[PDB]
């Protein structure tokens, strides 16, 4: 599960994280990217969605934007 490695890197495995840094949840989505990739179907923000829902949105994001959406952590997880 590559996303668990990304989430350990981005958020120490805390999929509910909401620190106030402009990013949300396990893979540290900004709000614009959450919304642009269909996130509002699941929850108001990434950190309010479940791990599985955040992953679904992350799969679409990765397809649309590439692994460059996660600049260091994608590589740390082995990424394509």
PDB file of C-alpha atoms in Angstrom:
ATOM      1  CA  UNK A   1       0.000   0.000   0.000  1.00  0.00           C
ATOM      2  CA  UNK A   2       2.125   2.850  -1.358  1.00  0.00           C
ATOM      3  CA  UNK A   3      -0.180   5.482   0.139  1.00  0.00           C
ATOM      4  CA  UNK A   4       0.601   4.347   3.661  1.00  0.00           C
ATOM      5  CA  UNK A   5       4.296   5.053   2.983  1.00  0.00           C
ATOM      6  CA  UNK A   6       3.321   8.498   1.565  1.00  0.00           C
ATOM      7  CA  UNK A   7       1.160   9.124   4.618  1.00  0.00           C
ATOM      8  CA  UNK A   8       3.915   8.153   7.042  1.00  0.00           C
ATOM      9  CA  UNK A   9       6.127  10.724   5.245  1.00  0.00           C
ATOM     10  CA  UNK A  10       3.501  13.475   4.951  1.00  0.00           C
ATOM     11  CA  UNK A  11       1.643  13.144   8.248  1.00  0.00           C
ATOM     12  CA  UNK A  12       3.285  10.395  10.379  1.00  0.00           C
ATOM     13  CA  UNK A  13       0.409   8.064   9.495  1.00  0.00           C
ATOM     14  CA  UNK A  14      -2.253  10.361  10.916  1.00  0.00           C
ATOM     15  CA  UNK A  15      -4.996  10.448   8.337  1.00  0.00           C
ATOM     16  CA  UNK A  16      -7.080  12.842  10.424  1.00  0.00           C
ATOM     17  CA  UNK A  17      -4.354  15.430  10.780  1.00  0.00           C
ATOM     18  CA  UNK A  18      -5.348  19.093  10.589  1.00  0.00           C
ATOM     19  CA  UNK A  19      -2.559  21.294  11.833  1.00  0.00           C
ATOM     20  CA  UNK A  20      -3.476  24.587  10.229  1.00  0.00           C
ATOM     21  CA  UNK A  21      -0.608  24.526   7.696  1.00  0.00           C
ATOM     22  CA  UNK A  22      -2.791  24.719   4.602  1.00  0.00           C
ATOM     23  CA  UNK A  23      -2.817  20.943   4.174  1.00  0.00           C
ATOM     24  CA  UNK A  24      -5.137  18.263   5.386  1.00  0.00           C
ATOM     25  CA  UNK A  25      -5.119  14.584   6.217  1.00  0.00           C
ATOM     26  CA  UNK A  26      -2.799  11.680   5.642  1.00  0.00           C
ATOM     27  CA  UNK A  27      -1.386  12.814   2.314  1.00  0.00           C
ATOM     28  CA  UNK A  28      -1.571  16.537   3.053  1.00  0.00           C
ATOM     29  CA  UNK A  29      -3.983  17.720   0.434  1.00  0.00           C
ATOM     30  CA  UNK A  30      -4.497  21.440   0.092  1.00  0.00           C
ATOM     31  CA  UNK A  31      -8.160  22.327  -0.145  1.00  0.00           C
ATOM     32  CA  UNK A  32      -8.112  23.343  -3.798  1.00  0.00           C
ATOM     33  CA  UNK A  33      -6.633  20.018  -4.829  1.00  0.00           C
ATOM     34  CA  UNK A  34      -9.064  18.096  -2.621  1.00  0.00           C
ATOM     35  CA  UNK A  35     -11.964  19.830  -4.316  1.00  0.00           C
ATOM     36  CA  UNK A  36     -10.550  19.734  -7.834  1.00  0.00           C
ATOM     37  CA  UNK A  37     -10.133  15.919  -7.675  1.00  0.00           C
ATOM     38  CA  UNK A  38     -13.650  15.210  -6.416  1.00  0.00           C
ATOM     39  CA  UNK A  39     -13.081  15.197  -2.646  1.00  0.00           C
ATOM     40  CA  UNK A  40     -16.294  16.963  -1.699  1.00  0.00           C
ATOM     41  CA  UNK A  41     -18.205  13.823  -2.698  1.00  0.00           C
ATOM     42  CA  UNK A  42     -16.654  12.177   0.365  1.00  0.00           C
ATOM     43  CA  UNK A  43     -16.133  14.957   2.929  1.00  0.00           C
ATOM     44  CA  UNK A  44     -15.693  18.713   3.366  1.00  0.00           C
ATOM     45  CA  UNK A  45     -11.903  18.349   3.652  1.00  0.00           C
ATOM     46  CA  UNK A  46      -9.389  15.500   3.296  1.00  0.00           C
ATOM     47  CA  UNK A  47      -8.907  15.088   7.055  1.00  0.00           C
ATOM     48  CA  UNK A  48     -12.683  14.473   7.492  1.00  0.00           C
ATOM     49  CA  UNK A  49     -12.671  11.693   4.915  1.00  0.00           C
ATOM     50  CA  UNK A  50     -11.577   8.130   5.703  1.00  0.00           C
ATOM     51  CA  UNK A  51      -8.160   6.755   4.680  1.00  0.00           C
ATOM     52  CA  UNK A  52      -9.835   4.837   1.826  1.00  0.00           C
ATOM     53  CA  UNK A  53     -11.681   7.940   0.586  1.00  0.00           C
ATOM     54  CA  UNK A  54      -8.501  10.055   0.804  1.00  0.00           C
ATOM     55  CA  UNK A  55      -6.714   7.341  -1.198  1.00  0.00           C
ATOM     56  CA  UNK A  56      -9.425   7.316  -3.884  1.00  0.00           C
ATOM     57  CA  UNK A  57      -9.061  11.060  -4.331  1.00  0.00           C
ATOM     58  CA  UNK A  58      -5.237  10.653  -4.281  1.00  0.00           C
ATOM     59  CA  UNK A  59      -5.410   8.073  -7.112  1.00  0.00           C
ATOM     60  CA  UNK A  60      -7.337  10.548  -9.296  1.00  0.00           C
ATOM     61  CA  UNK A  61      -4.938  13.335  -8.306  1.00  0.00           C
ATOM     62  CA  UNK A  62      -1.900  11.238  -9.147  1.00  0.00           C
ATOM     63  CA  UNK A  63      -3.388  10.341 -12.533  1.00  0.00           C
ATOM     64  CA  UNK A  64      -4.180  13.987 -13.326  1.00  0.00           C
ATOM     65  CA  UNK A  65      -1.147  15.755 -11.744  1.00  0.00           C
ATOM     66  CA  UNK A  66       1.552  13.067 -11.306  1.00  0.00           C
ATOM     67  CA  UNK A  67       3.570  12.077  -8.230  1.00  0.00           C
ATOM     68  CA  UNK A  68       4.878  15.665  -8.126  1.00  0.00           C
ATOM     69  CA  UNK A  69       1.849  16.460  -5.982  1.00  0.00           C
ATOM     70  CA  UNK A  70       3.906  14.857  -3.119  1.00  0.00           C
ATOM     71  CA  UNK A  71       7.513  16.215  -3.872  1.00  0.00           C
ATOM     72  CA  UNK A  72       9.774  14.109  -1.519  1.00  0.00           C
ATOM     73  CA  UNK A  73       7.319  11.679  -0.031  1.00  0.00           C
ATOM     74  CA  UNK A  74       6.360  10.018  -3.330  1.00  0.00           C
ATOM     75  CA  UNK A  75      10.053   9.087  -3.791  1.00  0.00           C
ATOM     76  CA  UNK A  76      10.347   7.892  -0.180  1.00  0.00           C
ATOM     77  CA  UNK A  77       7.403   5.519  -0.870  1.00  0.00           C
ATOM     78  CA  UNK A  78       9.163   4.140  -3.992  1.00  0.00           C
ATOM     79  CA  UNK A  79       7.067   6.129  -6.459  1.00  0.00           C
ATOM     80  CA  UNK A  80       6.728   5.808 -10.168  1.00  0.00           C
TER      81      UNK A  80
END
